[model samples]
Target chain A: MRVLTGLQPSGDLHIGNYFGAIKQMVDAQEKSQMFMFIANYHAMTSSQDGEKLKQNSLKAAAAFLSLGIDPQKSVFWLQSDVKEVMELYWILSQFTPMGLLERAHSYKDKVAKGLSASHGLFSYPVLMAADILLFDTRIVPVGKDQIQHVEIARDIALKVNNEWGEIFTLPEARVNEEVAVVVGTDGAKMSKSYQNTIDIFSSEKTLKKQISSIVTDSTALEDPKDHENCNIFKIAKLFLDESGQKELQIRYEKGGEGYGHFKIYLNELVNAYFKEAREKYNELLEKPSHLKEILDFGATKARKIAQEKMQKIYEKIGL
Target chain B: AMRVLTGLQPSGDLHIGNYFGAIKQMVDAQEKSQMFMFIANYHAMTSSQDGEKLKQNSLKAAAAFLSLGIDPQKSVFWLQSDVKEVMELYWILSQFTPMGLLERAHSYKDKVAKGLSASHGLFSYPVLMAADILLFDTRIVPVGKDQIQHVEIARDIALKVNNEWGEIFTLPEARVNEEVAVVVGTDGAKMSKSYQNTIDIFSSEKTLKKQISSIVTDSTALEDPKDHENCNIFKIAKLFLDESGQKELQIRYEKGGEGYGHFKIYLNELVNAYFKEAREKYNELLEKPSHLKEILDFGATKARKIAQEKMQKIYEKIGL
Candidate 1:
């Protein structure tokens, strides 16, 4: 089955990001046909700064490439590289209902902010729908917060199919909780806004102070510990299998060690997780040409599929 | 020095009244200037709901123009939707466009006033129309007086987009042709589709003769001298002739032996002879739809090359 995922380039990512997003992609790439693109065009809605967006897109590709989004295994590139989506964006706009866009979460916010001067924000979902349908994408992997984006894609596709005789494939959005969220040091949802995220590509020096600060309840170091209440246990379980987790669970019940030992253990797990990728990420960043060539290769491959899809769509829509 | 561009709707048949009144002047313009005439299949989206009908109409419209006098070799002719770069420019222009411009853009209100559903596509019409003209760096757009506002909007946007990140668009001029002859229909009124008195140039011979026979006339006797200057038959018949040909036909009308019945036959034969080569060419062209498709593809290749170069430069300015 073909699985598609669109990622917006937002500079750097953290462990909250790795477990919540990239790792799932890492796992998916091995087994499933994956299509990934850095949504630089979609990024235009918030920031029109071309230089920043371009830089952010590169950083994002580095982040993803470092985190094991294998370009060889997955179709990966920048969204604008395939110009066919821009054409599909307009063609699908005819089939999109204004009411469907009005219902979008961002639409109301933009209108309330008096930022309705640009139609880009209002018609963003249509472009997003174009991105999904143009690929003949059968599955769109989204976060728990974004079932609506996929829902909108589905609605747009269904409408076009009904009107133009099924030129698009209806895509389903699946939410994986395991890859959607991870707890932070403060025992809250791991988000950058909370200042609770441990940087995914942290050096050992950054992790010493960072990992030592995992907020935990005070208990006698010799007393039996409640594994459920420990933030360290919550984070460490992410890296460990059930067999390993069950062993760690007994250690928590055994209560021989203090939280400091577990903090160091968690720190090692975090750094060890990205050791090789971090080297590759640093190496990739030094040479932007290598990073760009990967994107160009992906663009050429994906554009062929998009062009064929658009030809069929053009005939169906009487273009 | 400026390029002349015109977008003709792919809505259906071209009547002889429409042919001589507007298309004849345009065919003449192709020799004098660089011309870009395209079948406005994109514009027809708002009103058209059927795919097969729109597909047939697009091919028919192209074939009609080619069959009429359009030199595809001299003038770049194709379908609007073939070069997808226009749609990209349309979206890019949306960033430069203010909501108020399109909110009051007459096309939408006109559609709603006519009781059509105000689709987003209809509301966003002017932006795409602006993109259509600006993408080619077109200068003189031959618009009817009713649609001069759309051209003006394109010009307004060209200036705005250029202001943002340096000059890119060539501001277009709307050349509203006021001297377009008001061709008289069968009912002695100015010809239009709504008038129901049009003589279709592409119909069967039976319909052509029937349409000519129905021309409103006077009660002059068969042997009486007819006023050639005051009759619809002479007026409609004069469209298919040159100055010398018209003078000869006018002499026949003044000599007084021929009735309106014989005059109708004269008008029908003039139309048949005038359009005989075009009609045969149009018929053969449609039979081989692949030829029509390839002709459009050839035009689109030239158009896309021009548009893509502009778009690449546009991307450089905007950081695509």
Candidate 2:
């Protein structure tokens, strides 16, 4: 099956991103035709700073490559590289009603958070709809929070197809029920909005500092730690295998080590796990031109499909 | 003296109100200023949904402009959809445009109050228009009084985008000719396609005569002196006549002998002869859709080249 995913170039990736969703797409590329795009255009709604946005795009590109996004297997691209999607964005706007956009929970949620209620934010759903429908994407892998956006895409597509006689393949959102929930230093679901994430690509010093910040109880040095209720254990076991986790659980139950020792182990596990990926990421970022070349090549492949669909759209809409 | 830009919605009919109110002014400015004229097919979607009708109207509108003596060689003219750069610029501008700026627009508010369907296309019309104007680096925008705010909105949007991003868009000035002649239809109201009261300038001979004879005039005796200025026939007829010819028609109206039917016949022949050459050209242009499409595509190439550089300037500034 052909699946589509949009990765926002918001900032650095976290462990939550990896185990929660990013790996789901990167791993599925071998089985499914993954249409992945760096959503820089959508990022503009939140941050208008170009220099920073450009840097973030590069950072995100390098991070994804290191994380296992094979550009050869998946059709990966930058959102703005395919201008036909922008055209489709405008065409789809004609079919979208004001009440529907007004009723958007995302827009209300953003405004309530003191974000600037710009038209870009207000009309973001239609552009997102354009992104999904332009490629004839059948399945869009979305998180629980983003299901409404995928539904919005389906609603907009239904309206347009009804008017033009089934011109679009209405997309469905595939929410992974069994995905691991990576927790933050605060013992909550790791989220950027909460400022509790562990940066997957931070330096050893930064990584150690982040891991040490994990919330834990102040038990005695010789007391037996609660293996079932330790935040450090919760984050630590994600990196361990069945045998490794069983050994750590026994150490936690037997109790002689302090939380400080476990923090050290968590730090080492992160570096040990990401050691090769870190080197590969450094190599990709050092030669920025090569990263750009790959995205450019992916854009060509993406636009080929987009343009073929748009020819029919233009004819149906009398463009 | 920067370039002048004007967009006309290609909604099909070419009435006298459109000619005297807009097309004539643009044609005159084509010789003096750098003019960018485009058939706004994209903007026509605010209300029009019929695809087949839109396609025909776009081509027919282009043919009308060429028939009415627009110098395509000197002035840029094309269908709006030919160049995709404008839409790219539009999406970029929307990010910078505040939702309040659009809500503050009287145009969208007026539409909403009148119980019109509030489509996103209807609300974002001004922004798309701003993109079309800004893409060409325009300084002067020719618009009606109702559309004056849209130009100001364009300027405001440009200034905001420049202040936030960089010095990118050219702020355009709205030049509204308040003295634009309000041509009256056969119903003695403003000539409009929506009112269906328009006396078409490009109809068959039989239809033209029928439309003129159907003008709503007062019941006056043939021997009675008529209100020449107030008369519907004279009101529409004087628009077709020269100063000397108008004086002759007024004298006949004041003579207290001629009937309104006689003036209708006079107006029909005079107006038919006035557009005789252009009417033939319009008919000939319609015969060749291939040539029309070719001319529009050729203009698109020129328009796209200029707009591509502008959009790239925008893309780099906005980090797209």
Candidate 3:
């Protein structure tokens, strides 16, 4: 089965993110035909400068590449490199009902905020459909919050086939809770807005500092902290196996656990998880030639498959 | 220099009435300026009930034109739908066109009178018709008396676009051919295919003669004289020859020597004589549907050049 995923280049990845989504995506790449793209076009709606967008995209690729996303074994590229998808975006727009796009969760939410939405933002799902359908994607891995967008992809494919014939595969979302939430330090679930994540790519100094800032309850050093609701344990639980988690949970429940000690342990777990990957990423970033070549290779391979699909669609539509 | 372009709908085969009233004027315009000959396969919605029939009728119309010696090498002979530029122009022109204008169009009014169900495509047909001429910067449109109103709608839209965008489309004049126009079916009305009176130029001569002999006349004996004025026989026979040929036939009508039977035979001979080439061409064309489709493809390619020029400017003005 073919599985597709997209990473938005909005900001840097963190330890909360490593265990949150990328680690599972990397593991899935080994077993499934995986498609990954740096969503730079999506990032344009928020970020302005070309340089800033490029930097964010590169940083995203670096994080994924370092975390064992083998481009040689699986498909990966920048989103904008596939121009035919944009061409599909225009053709599909003809049948896309205004009522459907108007009711999109993101559009309504933005309108409620009194923000002026551009045409690109209003037609985001159409673009997303092009993303999912361009690769004939069988499955898409999206967070629970993003499942609605993937559902839009499925809806668009079915609707287009109603008039133009069956040209695209309807993709399903994998929304299991194991890869769902890797809770942040504030324990409100891991998100950039929550400011609870420990930066994964941060130098040892930044990593140590971010972990030190984790907000814990004012329990005595010798008191047993509730492992279930505790922020430190919630984040650490993401990295450990069931027996390892049980061992830590027992230590937490048995008392005499200091907040400082748990912070150090979480920091060590975060470092141990990303250390080898981070070293490879640092080396990849230094060799910009290698990074450029990787993207170019991935984009060329992606374009070949996309062109064949578009040609078949054109023939089906009597173009 | 002014250019006028419009397509002929090849739904039904052409007859004397079609040639004199429209094709004659269309051919005459080629002498003065550039004239485009297009077969509107796209606009055949009124008759394009099925894909196969649509393809057949469209091919028949194209073969009819080629049989008439419409020079492909000189004039652009294209199929309308193949060029998306005209469709794009149709969409842009639709914005300025008031729905009321089409509601009053003589063609749609006639369709309603004939008990035909009017579709949105039929109602909005004039807008597309206007786009056809306007896309080519048409300065003159030679239409029959029946089709002049559609050309007027084109003028209205071209003027409206100019008012907003400053001299966009050139307003075209309708060249209505009054004389040498044939009357309708056996009832002595203007020729129409629906009335079952039209004698297709490409039909068998025997069928053509049978249809021509059905023209109604006064009870004048074979030896008695006949009045050519308002006479379908005289009208049908006059189309056969040039000015001198028609003049001699007019004299024969006033004399008391020959009656309606003599004139009916003469008209049958006239119909058979003038349409021989079109008939032979139609038979030859039936064998080459692929050739006819290729002609339309080539026509569409040439039409796109003009359409692209007009559309690019329209897009620029609209800030597309």
Candidate 4:
């Protein structure tokens, strides 16, 4: 089945992102058709500079490639590349009741948090509906936190279809089970907004030092450690093997294991696991010509489908 | 060449009534002028509406018009939904349009008359309609009398736009088809969907037959003569045929030999015969939707050419 996904190009990827979602995103492309786009339009609600948006969008494109998103397999294009989506956005907005949008969590959350919100933020889900429905997507692989947005997309699509007679495919949400929720190093839920994330691209030494600094209760060398309550063990479960995890748990609880030594071992495991992928990612970044050629080719493929669908929609609507 | 702007909501089917009443004039204008025919997909408001149906109606209407031979090459045709300039016009015009002026609109008057709750969209509809007309800088707007108020609103809004910026919009003239009757329903009142007496021209043959047969007639015997002068059927007949053909029907009614049943049958057959080719064309357009889509796409491209130029001038004048 055709699946769709979108990513906000805010900044660099984090360990939370890699373990929680990106791995599945990259693998999904090989198994089925995937549409991954940098949601620069959504990002515009906060950032306004054209050059910055463009630069960040490019950085996002590079990150997707570095994380193993094969453009040849999946349709990797920019959200702004297809101008038709905005047209759909406006059309969809007409059917979106003001009250429905007013009751949205994204808006309500901002109000609750006492943060300034723009009209773009208010009308975000309507645009997201267009982004999903424009491609006739069946499944949108989003997180559990974003399942509400997918519901809104379905509601708008259903309403449109009921009135206009089934012009859109009602999309469903796919919340990946393995990485349903990833806890941050600070022991709270892993989120960029919380500023408790581990940057996957940070220098190996910095990443190691940060890992060593994870807060733990002070105990003597001979005293037993609480492995179950430890943040390090919880984060380690995301990457380490079952047997390796069991051995580490036993070592932690049996005492005489220094926190300093355990931090070094976890750091080495991360660096060793990601070392080859990091080198490959750097190669893809430096080879700008190849990246451009691949993105352009994918754009052509994506544009062909979108343009045809938009054409049919226009004829159906009398435009 | 003189430019013509035509807009219709994408929410309804193109019935024979619409064909004889409005489409006839639009087709004539397309032949003689630079026509820009657009589906007002964004204008469908006050229904507390659904989106899929709105979208389908937009496409269906486009295909229907294409099939009816509104040549996109001869005149620009597109869905207005794609053109952002019209929205920009609506946004800008709203700032200038007095709430009182919009309150005075006939559609608003009609909506309230029908007991429909007023929506902000309904209240602001005329401004959007005005934008649709003025954005194209249309020289002529062919509208039914029921919609003359909207054209007038466009003129008022266009004048304001001119005052604020410059002579950016040409004040368009309203061209009403003089021959078409004030369409009435079976009950002999105005034939509107709200009244539930109107027929969907392209609906099933059985429904059409039932509706046409139910036309409220006095108990005039099958053998008795019926008055054709103010008769709803004759009034509709006058709209469908030319002067000579209508004169022939009028004489037949006056001769006092034929019954209302025969007359009604004649009228029904005439309605069916009139729209036969047009219906066939609609189906053909529906079957090859892409061909119709291409035409509309080309039309939107043409419309944007003019819109782009006018908007630049507007920006300069308004200092946007």
Candidate number with greatest TM-score:
2
Considering only chain B, report the TM-score of each candidate against the true chain B.
0.96, 0.90, 0.77, 0.75
Model 4 stretches with alpha carbons more than 4 Å out: A114-116, A177-180, A205-209, A254-257, B1-320
lDDT of 3 by residue, A27-130 (tens): 87668668899987666554334456677778777878888888888888988777677556545554455556656798667546664344345556767888
Q: Which 10-residue window of candidate 1 chain B scores lowest in summed lDDT?
A: B115-124
Better of 2 and 3 by lDDT: 2
Cα displacement (Å) at residue B268, model 3: 15
Query: Scoring only chain A, what TM-score does candidate 2 earn?
Result: 0.98
- Report the number of the highest-lDDT candidate: 2
* Total clashes in model 3, counting residue pairs 3 or more apart in sequence or in different chains: 9
lDDT, candidate 1, B218-277, per-residue tens: 999998888888999999888878999989888888898999899898888998988899
State the lDDT of candidate 3 residue by residue for B1-320, as single tens digits.
56767677755567766776666666665656687878776566443334456666667777877777676767788766567666546645655675567768877688778976554446566777888888888887777677889999889888877886787888889976556644456658778877777866777777877887788898877776677787877766766678999889888877778878778888878777777777787777789677776777787788887788887777665433
* Model 4 lDDT, full chain set: 0.73
Better of 2 and 3 by TM-score: 2
Q: Which pairs clash in the backbone of model 3?
A: A14-A200, A224-A255, B77-B299, B78-B299, B78-B300, B183-B191, B184-B189, B184-B190, B184-B191
Residue B102 error for model 2, in Å? 1.6
Q: Ten consecutive residues with minimal summed lDDT in candidate 4 chain A?
A: A114-123
